[PDB]
Write a protein that binds this ligand. Structure first.
Ligand code: NI
Length: 45
């Protein structure tokens, strides 16, 4: 259940915090809910 970290603000997308919804199921236009950084500028962590 891969966690991802925003390269801009350090927000961590942890699927565990979201009913195990994986990063790869998020919308095409999903952005960081803290800083609005785009999905494709997150690192696996
Ligand atoms: Ni961010």
């Amino acid at each position: 259940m891969q966690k991802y970290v925003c390269n801009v603000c350090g927000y961590e997308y942890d699927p565990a915090e979201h009913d195990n919804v994986p990063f790869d199921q998020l919308p095409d236009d999903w952005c960081c809910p803290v800083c609005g950084n785009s999905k494709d500028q997150f690192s696996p962590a």
